[PDB]
């Protein structure tokens, strides 16, 4: 309908943000960026709706424009900048670092990380092509382009990215039995090693997954994000470790911790 | 009709009025750009050559 759409009616806004139905009408429409609209957490949301550091949206621009906030290393000043999964958000003042990884409910959690871990990030490589002049490149889920990767890096492998400098320093192949983080679907936020891949030529590979509770599920290969070895992630996980408790199990945990 | 005359060498301008169908008549059927001698239009202008550059009608 004539051109690019610029608004977003709250209600059409993605749910994992947790915005209230009333109080306004629109939700902030995520800028074009390194993460898709529907799977992103705009800076406005993070600074005010999660960290509670700002009350106004107008106060969020106030915070940002002093370059207090900086994403994956760079300063960044875009109220609705599309922060996304694996990104690293930093506040120099307040000496605070953050990673965007998922809940178990499929929400972006406030997860505090050490200055040391704020060094780097993890990127799923999403395609590996031959660039102009024969220079091979990889391209990761957050749309970084990295020239001259290791030949043994293929698609779906995950990659340790420097940040300070753009380079790669490692890569975990997509083998049977490797720590996986689920990034979409219902099983969003669950974690579980990998059992086996259903091939399916020309239409969606299924990836059978089992966690550290001997529980099993299945997602499309698209939704699967390797992050290390069973036992050994390559980043700190949120509390929960992505195990998914039954509504009963959750009930009891909450009503077992009852006495003030 | 008013003649709006410019002397671009000096940067000057002043207008002049003319109520003489016969003097006026000299400018008729000439176009923009065409040159026009003087003595006809007035004795003031004996010598002077005018380039016609444009102008307005009533309305």
């Amino acid at each position: 309908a004539r051109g690019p759409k610029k608004h977003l009616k709250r209600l059409a806004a993605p749910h994992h943000w947790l915005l209230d139905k009333l109080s306004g009408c629109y939700a902030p429409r995520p800028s074009a960026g390194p993460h898709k609209l529907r799977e992103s957490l705009p800076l406005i949301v993070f600074l005010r709706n999660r960290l509670k550091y700002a009350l106004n949206g107008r106060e969020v621009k106030a915070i940002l424009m002093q370059r207090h906030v900086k994403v994956d290393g760079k300063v960044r000043t875009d109220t609705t900048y599309p922060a996304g999964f694996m990104d690293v958000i930093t506040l120099d003042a307040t000496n605070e670092n953050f990673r965007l990884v998922y809940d178990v409910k499929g929400r972006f959690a406030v997860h505090r990380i050490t200055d040391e871990e704020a060094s780097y990030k993890l990127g799923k490589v999403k395609k590996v092509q031959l660039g102009k002049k024969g220079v091979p490149y990889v391209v990761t889920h957050d749309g970084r382009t990295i020239r001259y990767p290791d030949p043994n890096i293929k698609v779906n492998d995950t990659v340790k990215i420097d940040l300070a400098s753009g380079k790669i320093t490692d890569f975990i192949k997509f083998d049977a039995g490797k720590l996986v983080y689920v990034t979409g679907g219902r099983n969003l936020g669950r974690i579980g090693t990998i059992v086996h891949k259903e091939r399916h030529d020309g239409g969606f590979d299924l990836v059978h997954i089992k966690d550290s509770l001997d529980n099993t599920f299945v997602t499309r290969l698209n939704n699967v994000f390797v992050i290390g070895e069973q036992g050994k992630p390559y980043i700190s996980l949120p509390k929960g470790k992505g195990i998914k408790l039954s509504i009963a199990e959750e009930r009891d945990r909450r009503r077992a911790q009852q006495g003030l | 009709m008013k003649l709006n005359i410019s002397y671009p060498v000096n940067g000057s301008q002043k207008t002049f009025e003319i109520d003489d169908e016969h003097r006026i008549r000299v400018f008729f059927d000439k176009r923009i750009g065409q040159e026009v001698d003087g003595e006809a239009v007035g004795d003031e202008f004996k010598g002077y050559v005018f380039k016609i550059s444009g102008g307005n009608d009533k309305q």
């Binding site: 509670k52 550091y53 700002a54 009350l55 106004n56 107008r58 106060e59 106030a62 915070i63 002093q66 207090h68 906030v69 506040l91 003042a93 307040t94 | -």
Partner: protein
């Protein structure tokens, strides 16, 4: 006037906006709600910042009497409130004048009247002044 008692709950040190922000929980038995000025003055007298750097608002007193609950801010300086505070708030306090202007539709009309003029205007003053001969 009766003991009062001003509490402060859910406090948060907020360095990236140069202030500490908190909830204000005002018990006030036998006192028909307190007031913003009394509360700025007392919260000033406790957070060691002085009045004109404290900001209070929100506020609705509890049903049936007894209690009112608001929200408070307190800046590290008077220079930091004056820059991070909403301008209607500084007005309520007396640390910024209400610069009044014409109507909103008086202004809009002026914008539009101004749209019918190309360039300065005074060039159009003199040329319309010649009409006053014809």
């Amino acid at each position: 006037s009766d003991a009062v008692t001003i509490r402060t709950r859910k406090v948060i040190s907020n360095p990236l906006l140069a202030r500490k922000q908190f909830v204000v929980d005002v018990l006030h038995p036998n006192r028909a709600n307190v007031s913003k000025d009394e509360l700025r003055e007392k919260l000033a007298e406790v957070y060691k910042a002085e009045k004109d750097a404290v900001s209070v608002f929100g506020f609705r007193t509890q049903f049936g009497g007894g209690k009112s609950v608001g929200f408070g801010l307190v800046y590290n300086s008077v220079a930091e409130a004056k820059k991070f505070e909403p301008t209607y708030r500084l007005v309520r306090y007396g640390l910024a004048e209400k610069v009044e202007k014409a109507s909103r539709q008086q202004r809009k009309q002026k914008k539009n009247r101004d749209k019918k003029i190309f360039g300065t205007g005074k060039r159009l003053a003199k040329k319309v002044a010649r009409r006053n001969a014809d």
